[PDB]
Design a protein around this ligand. Structure first.
Ligand SMILES: CC(=O)O[C@@]12CO[C@@H]1C[C@H](O)[C@@]1(C)C(=O)[C@H](O)C3=C(C)[C@@H](OC(=O)[C@H](O)[C@@H](NC(=O)c4ccccc4)c4ccccc4)C[C@@](O)([C@@H](OC(=O)c4ccccc4)[C@H]21)C3(C)C
Ligand SMILES: CC(=O)O[C@@]12CO[C@@H]1C[C@H](O)[C@@]1(C)C(=O)[C@H](O)C3=C(C)[C@@H](OC(=O)[C@H](O)[C@@H](NC(=O)c4ccccc4)c4ccccc4)C[C@@](O)([C@@H](OC(=O)c4ccccc4)[C@H]21)C3(C)C
Ligand SMILES: *[C@@H]1O[C@H](CO)[C@@H](O[C@@H]2O[C@H](CO)[C@@H](O[C@H]3O[C@H](CO)[C@@H](O)[C@H](O)[C@@H]3O)[C@H](O)[C@H]2NC(C)=O)[C@H](O)[C@H]1NC(C)=O
Ligand SMILES: *[C@@H]1O[C@H](CO)[C@@H](O[C@@H]2O[C@H](CO)[C@@H](O)[C@H](O)[C@H]2NC(C)=O)[C@H](O)[C@H]1NC(C)=O
Ligand SMILES: CC(=O)N[C@@H]1[C@@H](O)[C@H](O)[C@@H](CO)O[C@H]1O
Ligand SMILES: CC(=O)N[C@@H]1[C@@H](O)[C@H](O)[C@@H](CO)O[C@H]1O
Ligand SMILES: *[C@@H]1O[C@H](CO)[C@@H](O)[C@H](O)[C@H]1NC(C)=O
Ligand SMILES: *[C@@H]1O[C@H](CO)[C@@H](O)[C@H](O)[C@H]1NC(C)=O
Ligand SMILES: *[C@@H]1O[C@H](CO)[C@@H](O)[C@H](O)[C@H]1NC(C)=O
Ligand SMILES: *[C@@H]1O[C@H](CO)[C@@H](O)[C@H](O)[C@H]1NC(C)=O
Ligand SMILES: OC[C@H]1O[C@H](O)[C@@H](O)[C@@H](O)[C@@H]1O
Ligand SMILES: OC[C@H]1O[C@H](O)[C@@H](O)[C@@H](O)[C@@H]1O
Ligand SMILES: OC[C@H]1O[C@H](O)[C@@H](O)[C@@H](O)[C@@H]1O
Ligand SMILES: OC[C@H]1O[C@H](O)[C@@H](O)[C@@H](O)[C@@H]1O
Ligand SMILES: OC[C@H]1O[C@H](O)[C@@H](O)[C@@H](O)[C@@H]1O
Ligand SMILES: OC[C@H]1O[C@H](O)[C@@H](O)[C@@H](O)[C@@H]1O
Ligand SMILES: OC[C@H]1O[C@H](O)[C@@H](O)[C@@H](O)[C@@H]1O
Ligand SMILES: OC[C@H]1O[C@H](O)[C@@H](O)[C@@H](O)[C@@H]1O
Ligand SMILES: OC[C@H]1O[C@H](O)[C@@H](O)[C@@H](O)[C@@H]1O
Lengths: 401, 401
């Protein structure tokens, strides 16, 4: 559960979250409730259910990295627990909205009087095939169209195996909040509702880039060919995800390492401490990785320096903050920046400050010599940037060894 | 909730209830979960959903006498809460088992390993039409065929507006328990699960007769005609329900006033006390029903005697018991017996005894005189009978005024 509550990521919030004590709650989407055939209906690999089946809350993906469930704690059941505590009413349409007789009529009638409308969306994928685009699973496009027609307070919650296309509605003023919650396992619903009701502020951030379009990603991501010897050439090199997005100058929807809270954090007092170094003595096994500065005592993974910064909860509510550190290694055709540290502060009171610390190892500031076939620390001007996301970096400094 | 717990009526138990702490639980039937269109989707009179809609748990009937619901505490959600406390697993097939791709296979894969299989059945009906027969609503017949195919520990729970036909399954030894929970309103699951698990023994009993066949009841119960002036001739007279079965020598599957407990009760010490009479002063308003014994100072509703009996809990668990009193009023063309009292003893411990008391009013022992146009107490022998149902009557005596 605590994993779910720490992961769930807030992408948009025009004022609707956290919920106070809404009296009339509307829920949309089979994602909000059980698989109609049972949590384990899809079998040993969570891939045997029909393509149109209502599989319910998307708690894991398809294939060999799935597992059986003792139960699922559905969002609806958890939302209901909370409604009942508030002496409120709650109603869910969980059928296929396109194919079920009266579904659309029901939604039209249910939503206008709701204080808030949740829409649960999912996007299953699996081992054995690739997603054909950023397409919402089942009836999700429809759900969303209906929802914004009849309600001005839609809160979208996505259970997905990756980025999905929400371009149609993400800038609709009627969509007041959007959250992704990934694949939260069995404690799906009870990990989420605390966040929505504001018992714990959301603290999770995107572990990849949310581009406005599949066309903004590394070309030829999937090659389709009947050719007896199929060929993908990684001609983009090191430039995947936000590295690609950064180098090409492409603004995504939501950047790598982005995710809102219910409060704001102000960054301050950047500090690089050259005296804060230490030898790697802890790791279980060692590589035979070659590097310039090697002298028979030392390591690629020695922490050469350490960098510090200060966050201040400048908001109105307690909240956790994932601080990120990026470095610009100099060189030719070198990423605009690369993440070389993160430190999550837990539950920072309003007005309070905490120090963020980042141990930079040697390898963290090195390049591969193609010619000499070793790791070496380049010369040049290293940019160090610290902040909230891969594009929210209010503190830079420069280092030159 | 409490009305639900006090009402649910146990019709069969081969040994499977109460549940201890089963580790693997299977659930069958859309009646186990929510209306897929929302609890109030059927609208202002619970009647506007499509004839095949999966309306979920039948918490009330259709028509002017229905009402909106602020939520539904589904059987599935209530059973799951117990599952979780027992560190167990629970899975529900709640689709239409005859029309949903995969449903039947999923049922076949799930049941054989389950420690217990619950099937939730329903039978909607509404103002404006009569049931065409006793058949189960939706896919209930199919669920019951499937269940007894793949599981030897099937427990059946019926949400219904009246008697249904379960003659195919009720004497199948794979059906280990059968309960009817009628129409429990918004607290459907949390009322039922305490009874199954044995936090409270079941104490409800049937408020009508449950015949093997619709053919066993009063003939011409629903007249179907296009005649301009349709006629229903009540030639049966007072002989409806158990009066019909009793007089005509027909054996029901479960008689009027039948319901099992998790313990047994022995009856003793029938006492008819002619000294224990009382004048009627408690009515809010009075009738002007003529009666023969009227002396200006008395009333058809005076209690004229009181009968007592004793019940003892002769089993091994605490139970509540509804004790019933019937009187054979003598005369031409008279019901074999007529209910004239009931008394529910609450939570009688093992070994303990309690006294059951039954005030008998003058009207309770009277007949109407067509010739004289007044009520009178006939001459002859009155048989007074006491017991646990209309056919389980261990105690009797004759009163001859
Ligand atoms: C083919 C394959 O990927 O097999 C394995 C078995 O170990 C492999 C690794 C894989 O992790 C594993 C266990 C999985 O967990 C997958 O999620 C998984 C799959 C990806 C899936 O794979 C497929 O559907 C195959 O492409 C499919 N193959 C073909 O039909 C095929 C024919 C000609 C050319 C190429 C392919 C297949 C389907 C059903 C039974 C056997 C093979 C089979 C498989 O049943 C599962 O496979 C079997 O259970 C199985 C395979 C062969 C014989 C008997 C059983 C699958 C599941 C569980 C559904
Ligand atoms: C016919 C009837 O019972 O009407 C009422 C309106 O007050 C009546 C009392 C009744 O208890 C009440 C409120 C109900 O709650 C019923 O559950 C109820 C019904 C039984 C239902 O009525 C029927 O099914 C009638 O048999 C049905 N009969 C006919 O269509 C019919 C027409 C001409 C000649 C012969 C028969 C009907 C349907 C729809 C509108 C009017 C009549 C209408 C009705 O909308 C509901 O009716 C209306 O809402 C309504 C009726 C007439 C005009 C406008 C609205 C119904 C509901 C709520 C669905
Ligand atoms: C509910 O879960 C189902 C898995 O148990 C899922 O079905 C599977 O969906 C994928 C698409 O994500 C299908 O993928 C394949 O589609 C055709 C196969 O002929 C190929 O062109 C593709 O390359 C791809 O491999 C699976 O076929 C499908 N599995 C089955 C057995 O039908 C449902 O889609 C899920 N429901 C929803 C609404 O998301
Ligand atoms: C679900 O509820 C609906 C009513 O809201 C039921 O459909 C009615 O069923 C009766 C028969 O009992 C028909 O006379 C009506 O025409 C039906 N209503 C409409 C508008 O179609 C439906 O049968 C219930 N579901 C199940 C499976 O019993
Ligand atoms: C001849 C006649 O009036 N009989 C009607 C019948 O036509 C109608 O289908 C049914 C339900 O509407 O109600 C019956 O009373
Ligand atoms: C006239 C009458 O009802 N007699 C019954 C008798 O049939 C029954 O065997 C006995 C014990 O229950 O109680 C008395
Ligand atoms: C927003 O919702 C309202 C109903 O509350 C609807 O009238 C309006 O068309 C919607 N607008 C957009 C931009 O979807
Ligand atoms: C991609 O691979 C094909 C297959 O050998 C090759 O002909 C083509 O020139 C390659 N292009 C690159 C590496 O950019
Ligand atoms: C009862 O269940 C078993 C499987 O558990 C099945 O093989 C058997 O045929 C069933 N018997 C009846 C009478 O349905
Ligand atoms: C119903 O009763 C009337 C009056 O006795 C009678 O004329 C009519 O035939 C009866 N209908 C029957 C016999 O079902
Ligand atoms: O980096 C040195 C050299 O290594 C090799 C090739 O990939 C060249 O493109 C590159 O410039
Ligand atoms: O590109 C130069 C590089 O290519 C080849 C390797 O085996 C190296 O020894 C050499 O230095
Ligand atoms: O062509 C020789 C080969 O080794 C040298 C490098 O600089 C590479 O650019 C190249 O792959
Ligand atoms: O730098 C040139 C490079 O050539 C090749 C190898 O012998 C390497 O060890 C050497 O470093
Ligand atoms: O082992 C390192 C390896 O690097 C490459 C070449 O430079 C070779 O000379 C050498 O074998
Ligand atoms: O049977 C008489 C009448 O009852 C109801 C219908 O479902 C049919 O059974 C028929 O119109
Ligand atoms: O119209 C079909 C059906 O309607 C009502 O249920 C009655 O009037 C039936 O006798 C008739 O069969
Ligand atoms: O009750 C007396 C007398 O009343 C009238 C009819 O119902 C007769 O059948 C009956 O015998
Ligand atoms: O005609 C006589 C008439 O009144 C007298 C009673 O016995 C009734 O049964 C009957 O109907």
């Amino acid at each position: 559960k605590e994993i779910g509550s720490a992961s769930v990521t807030l992408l948009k919030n025009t004022g609707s979250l956290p919920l106070k004590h809404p009296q009339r709650i509307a829920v949309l989407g089979n994602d909000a409730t059980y698989n109609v055939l049972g949590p384990n209906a899809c079998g040993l690999a969570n891939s045997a259910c029909d393509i149109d089946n209502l599989n319910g809350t998307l708690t894991t993906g398809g294939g060999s990295g799935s597992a059986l469930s003792p139960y699922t704690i559905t969002p609806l059941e958890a939302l209901q627990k909370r409604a009942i505590e508030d002496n409120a009413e709650i109603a869910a349409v969980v059928a296929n909205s396109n194919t079920t007789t009266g579904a659309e009529d029901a939604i039209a009638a249910l939503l206008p009087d709701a204080d808030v409308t949740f829409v649960f969306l999912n996007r299953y994928s699996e081992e054995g095939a690739d997603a054909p685009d950023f397409s919402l699973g089942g009836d999700g496009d429809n759900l969303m169209d209906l929802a914004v027609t009849y309600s001005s307070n839609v809160v979208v919650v996505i259970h997905t195996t990756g980025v999905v296309d929400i371009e149609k509605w993400a800038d609709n003023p009627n969509v007041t909040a959007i959250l992704v919650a990934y694949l939260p396992g069995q404690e799906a619903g009870n990990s989420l509702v605390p966040v929505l009701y504001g018992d714990v502020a959301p603290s999770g951030k995107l572990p990849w880039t949310w581009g406005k379009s599949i066309d903004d990603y590394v070309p030829n991501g999937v090659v389709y060919t009947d050719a007896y010897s199929p060929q993908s050439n990684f001609t983009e090199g090191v430039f995947i995800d936000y590295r690609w997005f950064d180098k090409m100058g492409i603004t995504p929807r939501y950047e790598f390492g982005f995710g809102l809270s219910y409060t704001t954090f102000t960054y301050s007092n950047l500090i690089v401490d050259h005296g804060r170094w230490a030898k790697d003595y802890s790791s279980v096994m060692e590589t035979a990785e070659p590097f310039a500065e090697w002298d028979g005592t030392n390591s690629l993974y020695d922490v050469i320096f350490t960098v510090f910064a200060t966050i201040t909860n400048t908001g109105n509510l307690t909240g956790s903050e994932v601080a990120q550190l990026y470095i610009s290694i100099p060189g030719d055709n070198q990423p605009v920046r690369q993440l070389r540290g993160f430190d999550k502060i837990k539950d920072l009171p309003v007005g309070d400050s905490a120090v963020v610390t980042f141990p930079i190892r040697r390898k963290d500031v090195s390049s591969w010599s193609v010619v000499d076939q070793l790791w070496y620390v380049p010369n040049g001007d290293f940019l160090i940037s610290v902040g909230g996301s891969s594009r929210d970096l209010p503190l830079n400094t420069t280092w030159t060894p």
